[PDB]
């Protein structure tokens, strides 16, 4: 047995009635001095290291050529001057197993944490030495963490894309379905997760050029996409991950949901394709009144009205669709559909739930389009325009397919350094650079929307870690007060940085003038309502850091109206799965699942206590399954009001609660303004 995992297993050996949490420091120390320093390739000087990495196709020469070697040396000194030490064995293990650069035979270790951070910072700065040092300080202090694609691939030659979330709109044609399959395979080949909207596709039993009952529905396209994602699996190390989204008023909604039933046949069930359901407020209203709802055939609506069903307002056109004889509709029970959704989430965790009117009542770019679906992680909520892929000889009408670059603030380290403003602005700059350097040459709509919208996603993590290490319960009103103030400040500084970038570059995102930022309606609750902490305990947490007031928000509103905004979307809170270990942080803004997390890697068993877990804060680290999901919904809705995109909201369910409890949680989330619900995790 390895010495470091033997030391790491001494955490669970209870001495004097307490877990030996200090063993993890010894565990990581032994891990380093027995595996990492031995397996680390060391060069005489940094120049030899960089030459070796560039020559052997490990790094990219173009980005390293913008700095003189003295500047690169200064950046590396800045990284190593911090003398960063991993606080736990899991942090270092995850870094050196997932993100640290290794030789071509996966034998030795080329990059330390400081080397990777310095390379990512030099990639971000794009020739600026001082900006590179600022990025080094930001990441070595672990105030900001670039997403897994960016952190893993920044500055590497044989790399995937820095963006891993893509959203595709599929038009109701065979040419568009073929192009969707092709683009899905191309993006899965790049390593990204692809989400597809299947609402515009006509339902099963619709006509294909005046021959009736000819269309196979969205389930045939679902099978096509599932096999396309199985094919493009990148060695199978990380198999192709796709998501399909369907509006709840689509006729194929029941067959769409039946693809996830355990008793589904092999000719229907999809395995590699996650599913999400988009629910307008009309469906919730119909289920609330116990009235008879109707699902519609999309092609009939398109023929009758000239627009797709999901491109229309269901809360204003549902009655017109029902009364229209030329529209084909099927009678359903909305409460039965809700119960089926709850049962499917209990048994499989699917579908993802998107509350469409919750997304679009606060959506800033409804002039471009309404948000019709989310991503594979169920937190990207941006306007999309469907493309019209025509025959080979004809020109294609390229729409807007969503993609944003992810990045997380570490709430604990940002709050410790009293650096919300600087961290948010530097992270915004880094995400803007990642957006600018991304060029997808096989997804035309993704490329066009990346150039036009310039959307970024700046998330946060370690919310529960910060609260538990500060003696605040996750369900407590003080926690929601802190989240309100913190994320209002993050929104303020992200909007300020976007406006400053627009002023400097002299350009805004496409169709900015129609957005709510340009009209000033976005800032109504910010110029009217003060978001300063209401509790003295929370107010001391922000001591030494200026909290923008209503006057500051009015000044920012004037600044945005006079200079514009560079990013259509700025903030989205992703799950942040594996980078949470490296940053020694709790995953996303969701509460922790286990206080001490037990994992098996190969034939070795190791335990990961939550960051900062001890006996003085053991009960503040309440597990997500033991807490009220209504209070978690309250917390996420408090955070969501300052986030322009969505939040990956996992529901943590006990075995005792029925499908009625899951439905009640979903309805309370819809009532409280929750935009999306990610997973129904059951213990």
């Amino acid at each position: 047995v390895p010495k470091w995992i033997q030391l790491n297993n001494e955490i669970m050996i209870q001495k004097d009635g307490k877990f030996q949490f200090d063993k993890d420091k010894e565990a990581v120390h032994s891990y380093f001095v027995d595996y990492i320093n031995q397996n680390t390739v060391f060069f005489h000087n940094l120049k030899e290291k960089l030459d070796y990495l560039v020559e052997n196709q490990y790094y990219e020469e173009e980005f390293l050529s913008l700095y003189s070697f003295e500047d690169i040396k200064e950046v590396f000194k800045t990284a190593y001057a911090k003398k960063f030490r991993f606080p736990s064995f899991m942090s270092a293990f995850k870094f050196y197993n997932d993100y640290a650069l290794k030789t071509n035979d996966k034998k030795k270790i080329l990059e330390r944490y400081e080397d990777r951070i310095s390379i990512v910072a030099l990639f971000f700065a794009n020739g600026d030495t001082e900006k590179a040092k600022e990025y080094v300080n930001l990441m070595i202090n672990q105030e900001y963490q670039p997403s897994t694609p960016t952190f893993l691939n920044a500055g590497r030659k044989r790399r995937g894309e820095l963006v891993s979330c893509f959203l595709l709109e599929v038009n109701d044609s065979l040419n568009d379905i073929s192009r969707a399959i092709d683009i899905s395979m191309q993006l899965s080949k790049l390593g990204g997760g692809v989400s597809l909207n299947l609402s515009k596709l006509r339902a099963k039993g619709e006509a294909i050029k005046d021959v009736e009952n000819a269309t196979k529905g969205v389930v045939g396209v679902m099978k096509l996409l599932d096999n396309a994602f199985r094919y493009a699996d990148q060695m199978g190390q990380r198999q192709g991950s796709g998501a399909a989204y369907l509006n709840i008023f689509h006729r194929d909604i029941n067959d769409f949901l039946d693809t996830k039933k355990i008793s589904a046949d092999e000719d229907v069930r999809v395995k590699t394709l996650s599913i999400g359901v988009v629910i307008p407020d009309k469906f919730v209203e119909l289920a609330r009144e116990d009235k008879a709802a109707y699902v519609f055939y999309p092609h009939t609506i398109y023929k009758e009205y000239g627009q797709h069903m999901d491109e229309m307002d269901m809360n204003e056109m549902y009655d017109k669709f029902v009364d229209n004889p030329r529209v084909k509709k099927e009678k359903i029970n909305p409460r039965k559909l809700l119960e089926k959704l709850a049962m499917l989430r209990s048994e499989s965790g699917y579908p993802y739930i998107m509350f469409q009117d919750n997304v679009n009542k606060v959506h800033a770019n409804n002039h471009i389009s309404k948000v019709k679906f989310s991503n594979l992680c169920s937190e990207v909520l941006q306007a999309s325009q469907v493309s019209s892929y025509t025959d080979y000889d004809e020109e294609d009408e390229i729409g807007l397919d969503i993609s944003c670059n992810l990045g997380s603030l570490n709430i604990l380290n940002v709050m410790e350094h009293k650096s919300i403003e600087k961290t948010v602005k530097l992270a915004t700059d880094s995400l803007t650079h990642v957006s600018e350097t991304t060029d997808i040459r096989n997804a035309p709509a993704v490329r066009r929307a990346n150039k036009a919208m310039k959307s970024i996603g700046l998330g946060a993590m370690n919310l529960h870690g910060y609260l538990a290490q500060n003696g605040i319960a996750y369900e407590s009103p003080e926690a929601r007060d802190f989240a309100n103030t913190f994320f209002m400040m993050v929104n303020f500084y992200s909007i300020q940085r976007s406006a400053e970038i627009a002023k400097e570059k002299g350009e805004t995102f496409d169709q900015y003038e129609g957005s709510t930022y340009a009209t000033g309606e976005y800032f109504d609750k910010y110029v009217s309502t003060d978001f300063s902490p209401k509790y003295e305990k929370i107010a001391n947490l922000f001591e030494g850091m200026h909290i923008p007031t209503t006057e500051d928000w009015k000044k920012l509103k004037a600044f945005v109206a006079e200079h514009g905004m560079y990013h259509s979307y700025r903030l989205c809170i992703a799950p942040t799965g594996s980078i949470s270990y490296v940053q020694s942080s709790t995953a996303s803004v969701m509460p922790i699942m286990e206080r001490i997390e037990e994992r098996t890697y190969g034939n070795s068993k190791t335990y990961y206590p939550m960051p900062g877990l001890a006996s003085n804060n053991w009960f503040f680290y309440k597990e997500a399954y033991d807490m009220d999901m209504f209070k978690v919904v309250d917390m996420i809705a408090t955070i969501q009001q300052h986030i322009d995109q969505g939040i990956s909201f996992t529901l943590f369910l006990k075995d005792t609660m029925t499908t009625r409890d899951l439905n009640r949680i979903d309805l309370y989330a819809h009532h409280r303004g929750i935009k999306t619900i990610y997973y129904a995790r059951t213990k």
């Binding site: 116990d290 049962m343 048994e347 899951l662 439905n663 309370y668």
Partner: protein
């Protein structure tokens, strides 16, 4: 007084081998000596044969002769487990660990092994001797079935348990523990039915039935000793396994309402270490907060 609770226990224990992924045993299997792998394959093959006949013949025939729809439902369920679940699980294990030729060879080996043929001949002979409306022939077959469930399987079970207890072949071992959990309740249930018939007899008849049960046990035991030596001498465990089968013979006798026949012995402690969401409709008040 008991069938309903056995019905509920049997159906709640329902499982399929496919629930257990077996590729995790690949390395601990690769690491065993040729002698160990040989004994392991043969042991499971002997078990497969027993379950094949218990499922094809033993349980269905007892079901046919036992009165009452609920008793028949339990016995039918147990029969299904024998051949549709237990016997098949061994093939899942074989197909994971062994190449086709080794699998073919071990099934050929069961056909020609004299101890395995003798025990099958004896047990199946008693099953096929049951006469309609003749409770004595039925009792004799139920004794044979209890001896198969609670005694005869155990020369086979020893080895997977012995490995499981050392942290080896733990996925295969998980399957075997599920099989063993089933056989334990099968042996108790059939034992209770046998006792029902025994309790109807005169004292003189009872004395003869005890003679039958003890003579049969001794005959099976002597054959099992030779089988055990044949399989386990090459891995050095024959004496240990013998202690285990005697232990389980006593459990079989107890399942039949008889006193233990063999003296207690210390069993290898390794082997001892080897041992939808509810749908609720939405209310109107659920939509308001």
């Amino acid at each position: 007084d008991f069938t309903q609770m056995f019905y509920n226990q049997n159906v709640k224990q329902f499982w399929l081998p496919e629930e257990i992924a077996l590729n995790g045993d690949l390395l601990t299997w690769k690491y065993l000596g040729k002698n160990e792998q040989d004994t392991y394959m043969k042991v499971l093959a002997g078990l497969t044969l027993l379950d094949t006949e218990q499922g094809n013949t033993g349980m269905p025939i007892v079901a046919e002769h036992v009165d009452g729809h609920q008793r028949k439902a339990v016995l039918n369920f147990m029969a299904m487990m024998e051949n549709a679940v237990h016997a098949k699980s061994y093939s899942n294990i074989f197909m994971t660990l062994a190449p086709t030729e080794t699998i073919n060879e071990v099934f050929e080996w069961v056909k020609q092994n004299k101890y395995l043929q003798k025990k099958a001949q004896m047990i199946v002979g008693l099953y096929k001797a049951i006469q309609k409306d003749d409770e004595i022939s039925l009792f004799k077959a139920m004794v044979a079935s209890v001896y198969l469930e609670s005694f005869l399987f155990y020369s086979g079970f020893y080895y997977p348990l012995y490995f499981y207890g050392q942290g080896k072949l733990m996925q295969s071992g998980e399957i075997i523990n599920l099989i063993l959990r089933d056989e334990a309740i099968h042996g108790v249930y059939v034992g209770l039915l046998a006792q029902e018939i025994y309790n109807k007899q005169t004292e003189e008849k009872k004395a003869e039935l005890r003679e039958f049960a003890i003579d049969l046990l001794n005959q099976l035991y002597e054959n099992e000793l030779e089988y055990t030596e044949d399989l386990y001498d090459q891995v050095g465990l024959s004496h240990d396994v013998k202690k285990f089968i005697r232990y389980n013979a006593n459990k079989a006798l107890m399942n039949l309402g008889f006193d233990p026949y063999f003296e207690e012995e210390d069993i290898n402690p390794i082997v001892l270490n080897g041992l939808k969401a509810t749908v609720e409709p939405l209310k109107d008040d659920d939509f308001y907060f």
